[PDB]
Write an enzyme that holds these catalytic residues in place. Structure first.
Site, PDB file in Angstrom:
ATOM      1  N   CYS A  10      44.541  30.444  46.900  1.00  0.00           N
ATOM      2  CA  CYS A  10      43.841  30.380  48.124  1.00  0.00           C
ATOM      3  C   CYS A  10      43.065  31.563  48.428  1.00  0.00           C
ATOM      4  CB  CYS A  10      44.543  29.869  49.305  1.00  0.00           C
ATOM      5  SG  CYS A  10      43.468  29.224  50.780  1.00  0.00           S
ATOM      6  N   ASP A  77      11.937  43.873  45.846  1.00  0.00           N
ATOM      7  CA  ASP A  77      13.289  43.253  45.513  1.00  0.00           C
ATOM      8  C   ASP A  77      14.027  44.258  44.500  1.00  0.00           C
ATOM      9  OD1 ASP A  77      15.664  41.858  45.115  1.00  0.00           O
ATOM     10  OD2 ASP A  77      14.488  40.008  45.010  1.00  0.00           O
ATOM     11  N   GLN A  82      20.117  47.983  40.029  1.00  0.00           N
ATOM     12  CA  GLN A  82      20.212  48.190  41.542  1.00  0.00           C
ATOM     13  C   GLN A  82      20.873  47.278  42.237  1.00  0.00           C
ATOM     14  OE1 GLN A  82      15.947  48.658  42.283  1.00  0.00           O
ATOM     15  NE2 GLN A  82      15.773  50.870  41.628  1.00  0.00           N
ATOM     16  N   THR A 107      15.510  57.088  43.322  1.00  0.00           N
ATOM     17  CA  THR A 107      15.249  56.012  44.271  1.00  0.00           C
ATOM     18  C   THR A 107      16.191  55.593  44.854  1.00  0.00           C
ATOM     19  OG1 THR A 107      12.882  55.511  43.219  1.00  0.00           O
ATOM     20  CG2 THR A 107      13.900  54.103  44.734  1.00  0.00           C
ATOM     21  N   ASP A 667      39.284  32.145  23.251  1.00  0.00           N
ATOM     22  CA  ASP A 667      39.271  31.289  21.942  1.00  0.00           C
ATOM     23  C   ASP A 667      38.866  30.073  21.881  1.00  0.00           C
ATOM     24  OD1 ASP A 667      39.415  33.664  20.467  1.00  0.00           O
ATOM     25  OD2 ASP A 667      41.713  33.551  20.543  1.00  0.00           O
ATOM     26  N   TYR A 850      37.218  31.681  12.871  1.00  0.00           N
ATOM     27  CA  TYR A 850      38.631  31.320  13.380  1.00  0.00           C
ATOM     28  C   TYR A 850      39.643  31.036  12.807  1.00  0.00           C
ATOM     29  CZ  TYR A 850      41.016  30.013  17.768  1.00  0.00           C
ATOM     30  OH  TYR A 850      41.876  29.761  18.774  1.00  0.00           O
TER      31      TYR A 850
END
Ligand SMILES: [Zn+2]
Ligand SMILES: [Zn+2]
EC number: 5.6.2.-
Length: 1102
Positions: A10, A77, A82, A107, A667, A850
């Site tokens: 929770c 934006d 950033q 900046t 996996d 695999y």
């Protein structure tokens, strides 16, 4: 949507919540009863429940405050970098700025310092030069308002500005202070005093020239030097250091290490502020490599004509570079050398006066340390392969050669000895200088051995990768393409370079006839100028979550470990991609597991359907015990030093907040899909940007190809895993409990399958002892041996019928998990579990596909691996294209790179690849040879079928006699039996003996059997055999065969006598098949759980 329950899941109350609710990003039923609130925050508030959900609201608000402010008092934006840095800035974290060439760090520093000044918090901006300070303060003053209080100091200072700085520093009347590194060095005390809420460092290495400055920085963000000393006392000892649980630090943001972060003091930043300051590494490479068969200067001049501007030639010696410069000086090209007039030619090439620059390896390598401008260099030319050469005479002795050859030959001693000592030792036993050379030829594989000039040549692949990497970087957003051209005629050196480059960088070098030059140049220039349109905003941050640290290391090895955040319980690496930043971290195992607290051993029953209840996993780092319950000490050895997983989850939540998109790279089996679903479910009320990856290889190619088929979590795999685990818990606990009453020990039965296998092994003993027949072996004149029934005494075999034919023998398919375990554990003297550990260590280290697969299917790519190896090896005639299977969950066990075991040995002993033992190499060799033999041409064979007569009995033998056309015969050897004429063969010896016609089980035959009978999975095999072994039901005799113990026989006897119906094969097989059907969503999940319950309901009565 699996209807389960997780214990610390929770988001607001910090307690327990359900699957369905975290999937919908909601708090628990306690925190919020209704299903659909219009707003979680104000709903939690309206019901007096709002608690830890506050932090997230506060986070997002006081982040978009930073965003809107940045958008207002600046351009527009935020870029991805950033965006991430901002998301780390509001949480008061410290970090290096992982970004490529000029993305606006200054900046961001100014803007963050200013925005922080808007609260009362005070920041400090540190710069390398005393000139950049002035520029910064200038760009800052007009950027600020009436509110902010900014100052500064330098060497060329004013009169009253100096004392203005000193006075304003004396009584804390500031918000921003901008000074040089010189000031940090000189005025150390004054800085050690204050506590800044933000410290920005534009040049890391500019300050890292003195430990005093590191300690000063730490004492600047707000750390007492006592703690610092008590951490230095720990890192010097070796181990890593944990910091005070509730200590409030300041914010420290730095750039990257321009050079080598040498020293041990820097490690403090990892333990006190939880961030590593490593050198900026970029594996971001978009390059086409082309090789030209000879050093013909005509080709050179033509290429120079096509490229025009931005060409860089690398020579081996300064002499041939001189001669090359002489040649090119006549053709009116604008070429400049680096061995006489350097700075003029470099700073000309830097601007554009010169079009072609020529350097030698070491020259350029050391003299470029100043600048190294990448926007100019577009083409790299190598006048010969950048190699490293050694002498193969007795004297002029290279130590590694002597070491290898002597270790294999005669006087092998320890692991290392002095150079001249090995020299004097090999001055004795060797036959000749010639024989020494031949020994080097046979032993050394992966390098060039010129036995003519006595020279050992080894392609300096790192040098080549840096030098080639000069032609492609990240400039203003786009990974601009480049071209690397090698003029190498020695084919061997070229092969070596090809395999090493393929190993470390996964980059193909193409031939001249396959390269279309105009197109390449067009590509180069197009992308180059495309990086000038200044859109520069495709920047995203990515997060890959894996469960094994090994996959993480081998992920950093090709993504490029730049920095490493010590995030709570885990460690998260960041790297630079073409599309922004990537973050990858390890889970270090499972996270949740079935709690044993309530309901039916953990699985509750509500609303007519079963609901699994999971809880976080805790591993004792001291003894090794794993447990679920929430406790302070280990429930076995009573230790507080335990590794929790709920911590890992909290870390993953904070990290989840800080990123943009999240991928879960567990996996590609059911187990991985469960860890996947646990993670995503727990993270879902934090960010809605989560998906699944399924990497079948740990390579750039595997990463990419898995990202191509990116999807959301498949629930049928999860449900299958849950049904499996619930079965094992149920039957396991029940049978274990029945046995707790008869033998005393409380940890016996681990499931149904285990007891089935024990059934096979235990029942085997009597049928092995039973079917012991008497045989005779007779070896024949002009013939092999022949085993037939016992008691024969006519001393003669009479050929009756004879027939010969020609047949093409196909090879055996590639290793599946069963095949691999069986034949490898049979060939090598190894147990199946060790073999499994090896296969996994090879997959996770990116050397095979695999390792858990039940399909012989292989991809076109794998076939092409086979072909590139057969082509390299000089035997591409015998290549064949067998894909083996249409039906495949995964792909068979093959290597990912066309590199044999010997070559890999060289790479290891040298230092390219690391962390592989002799066993790993042997296993890999087995997989390699098997896979190649698969993809090689059918052997054309002449075989015969002889019908012989012995003692009036007609016995037929069938033997391969002539190998009339080779094929896979070079990988998996094939033997020929001598020819049988149609005459009478006298018996030389009649060896009367007896062996048992029904052999026992080895581990290999156990795996093979439960494969044949459909009793097990590629993930269960070695787990099963080792479960039986370690729990004392089985022992391994002198011939490494598996035999039951007294304990085992008694136990299985009890099981068969009381509960045979519940354990025998057909039931295990039927449940295995049914669960398989569940995995594909063909068979209902809750219904099969119901089945298991109803059948456990009756076992409780027996
Ligand atoms: Zn709650
Ligand atoms: Zn313990």
């Amino acid at each position: 949507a699996v209807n389960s329950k997780y214990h610390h899941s929770c988001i607001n109350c910090g307690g327990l919540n359900t699957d369905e609710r975290n999937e919908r990003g909601l708090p628990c039923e306690v925190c919020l009863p209704e299903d659909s609130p219009s707003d979680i925050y104000r709903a939690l508030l309206e019901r007096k429940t709002l608690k830890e959900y506050r932090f997230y609201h506060e986070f997002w608000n006081e982040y978009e405050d930073f965003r809107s402010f940045f958008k207002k008092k600046f351009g527009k934006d935020l870029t991805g970098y950033q965006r991430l840095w901002a998301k780390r800035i509001v949480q008061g974290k410290s970090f290096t700025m992982v970004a490529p060439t000029g993305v606006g760090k200054t900046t961001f520093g100014m803007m963050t310092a200013l925005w922080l000044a808007r609260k009362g918090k005070k920041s400090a901006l540190v710069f390398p030069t005393v000139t950049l300070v002035k520029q910064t303060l200038e760009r800052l003053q007009k950027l600020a308002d009436e509110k902010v209080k900014i100052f500064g100091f330098y060497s060329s200072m004013k009169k009253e500005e100096k004392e203005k700085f000193e006075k304003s520093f004396e009584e804390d009347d500031y918000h921003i202070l901008v000074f040089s590194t010189q000031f940090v060095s000189k005025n150390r005390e004054k800085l050690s005093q204050k506590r800044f809420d933000f410290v920005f460092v534009d040049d890391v290495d500019a300050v890292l020239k003195a430990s005093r400055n590191i300690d000063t920085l730490l004492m600047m963000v707000g750390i007492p030097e006592e703690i610092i000393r008590k951490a230095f006392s720990t890192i010097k000892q070796g181990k890593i250091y944990e910091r005070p649980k509730n200590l409030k630090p300041g914010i420290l943001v730095v750039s990257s290490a321009t050079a080598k972060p040498r020293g041990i003091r820097p490690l403090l930043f990892r333990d006190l502020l939880n961030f590593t300051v490593g050198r900026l590494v970029s594996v971001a490479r978009n390059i086409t490599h082309v090789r030209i068969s000879s050093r013909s200067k005509e080709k050179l001049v033509e290429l120079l004509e096509i490229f025009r501007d931005g060409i860089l030639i690398f020579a081996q010696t300064e002499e041939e570079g001189k001669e090359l410069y002489e040649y090119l000086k006549r053709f009116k090209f604008n070429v400049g050398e680096t061995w006489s007039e350097f700075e003029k030619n470099f700073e000309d090439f830097k601007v554009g006066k010169i079009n072609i620059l020529i350097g030698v390896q070491a020259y350029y390598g050391k003299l470029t340390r100043g600048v190294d401008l990448p926007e100019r260099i577009k083409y790299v030319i190598f006048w010969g392969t950048p190699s490293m050469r050694f002498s193969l005479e007795l004297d002029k002795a290279p130590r590694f050669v002597l070491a290898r050859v002597l270790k294999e030959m005669g006087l092998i001693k320890a692991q290392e000895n002095p150079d001249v000592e090995e020299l004097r030792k090999i001055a004795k036993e060797h036959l000749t200088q010639k024989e020494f050379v031949e020994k080097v030829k046979e032993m050394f594989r992966g390098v060039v051995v010129k036995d003519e000039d006595l020279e050992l040549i080894i392609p300096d692949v790192y040098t080549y990768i840096q030098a080639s990497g000069r032609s492609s970087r990240i400039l203003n957003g786009v990974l601009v393409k480049g071209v690397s051209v090698i003029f190498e005629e020695d084919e061997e050196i070229f092969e070596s370079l090809k395999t090493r480059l393929l190993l470390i960088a996964e980059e193909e070098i193409i031939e001249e006839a396959e390269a279309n030059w105009k197109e390449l140049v067009h590509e180069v220039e197009e992308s180059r100028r495309r990086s000038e349109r200044e859109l520069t905003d495709t920047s995203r941050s990515l997060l890959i979550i894996v469960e094994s640290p090994t996959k993480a290391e081998t992920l950093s090895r090709f993504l490029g470990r730049a920095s490493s955040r010590k995030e709570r319980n885990i460690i998260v690496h960041e790297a630079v991609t073409g599309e922004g930043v990537i973050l990858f971290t390890a889970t270090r195992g499972h996270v949740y597991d079935l709690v044993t607290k309530g309901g039916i051993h953990g699985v509750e029953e509500e609303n007519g359907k079963f609901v699994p209840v999971y809880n976080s996993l805790k591993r004792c780092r001291d003894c090794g015990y794993q447990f679920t319950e929430d406790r302070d000490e280990c429930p076995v050895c009573s230790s507080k030093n335990i590794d929790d997983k709920t911590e890992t989850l909290r870390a993953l939540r904070e990290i989840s907040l800080e990123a943009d998109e999240i991928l879960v790279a567990t996996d590609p089996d059911v187990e991985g899909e469960k860890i996947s679903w646990d993670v995503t479910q727990y993270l879902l009320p934090s960010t809605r940007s989560l998906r699944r990856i399924e990497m079948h290889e740990i390579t750039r190619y595997g990463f990419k190809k898995a990202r191509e088929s990116v999807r959301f979590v498949d629930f049928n795999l999860v449900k299958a895993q849950i049904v499996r685990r619930v079965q094992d818990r149920w039957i396991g606990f029940e049978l274990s409990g029945k046995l707790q009453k008869r033998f005393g020990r409380s940890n016996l039965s681990a499931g149904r399958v285990q007891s089935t296998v024990l059934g096979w092994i235990v029942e085997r003993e009597e049928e092995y002892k039973k079917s012991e027949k008497d045989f005779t072996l007779l070896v024949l004149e002009n013939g092999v041996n022949l085993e037939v029934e016992g008691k024969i005494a006519d001393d003669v075999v009479t050929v009756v019928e004879l027939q010969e034919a020609e047949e093409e023998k196909n090879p055996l398919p590639p290793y599946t998990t069963s095949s691999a375990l069986s034949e490898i554990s049979q060939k090598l003297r190894l147990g199946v579990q060790e073999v499994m550990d090896i296969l996994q260590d090879l997959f996770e280290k990116g050397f095979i596909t695999y390792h858990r697969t039940d399909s012989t299917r292989i991809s076109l790519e794998g076939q092409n691996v086979a072909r590139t190896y057969l082509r390299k090896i000089g035997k591409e005639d015998i290549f064949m294209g067998r894909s083996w299977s249409t039906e495949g969950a995964h792909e068979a066990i093959r290597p990912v790179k066309p590199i044999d075991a010997r070559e890999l040995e060289e790479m290891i002993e040298e230092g390219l690849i690391a962390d592989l033992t002799k066993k790993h190499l042997r296993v890999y060799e087995l997989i390699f040879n098997r896979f190649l033999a698969s993809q090689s041409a059918a052997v054309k064979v002449k075989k015969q079928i002889v019908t012989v007569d012995v003692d009036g009995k007609r016995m037929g033998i069938e033997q391969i006699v002539e190998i009339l056309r080779d094929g896979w015969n070079l990988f998996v050897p094939l033997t020929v039996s001598p020819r049988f004429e149609h005459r009478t063969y006298k018996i030389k010896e009649k060896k009367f003996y007896k062996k048992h016609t029904v052999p026992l089980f080895t581990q290999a035959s156990i795996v093979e059997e439960m494969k044949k009978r459909g009793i097990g999975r590629p993930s269960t095999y070695a787990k099963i055999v080792e479960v039986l072994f370690r729990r004392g039901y089985v022992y391994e005799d002198k011939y490494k065969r598996v035999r039951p113990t007294r304990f085992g026989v008694m136990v299985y006897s009890y099981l068969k006598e009381r509960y045979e119906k519940y354990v025998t094969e057909e039931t295990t097989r039927r449940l295995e098949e049914i669960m398989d059907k569940v995995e594909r969503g063909e068979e209902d999940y809750q219904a099969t759980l119901r089945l298991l319950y109803e059948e456990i309901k009756s076992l409780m009565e027996e």
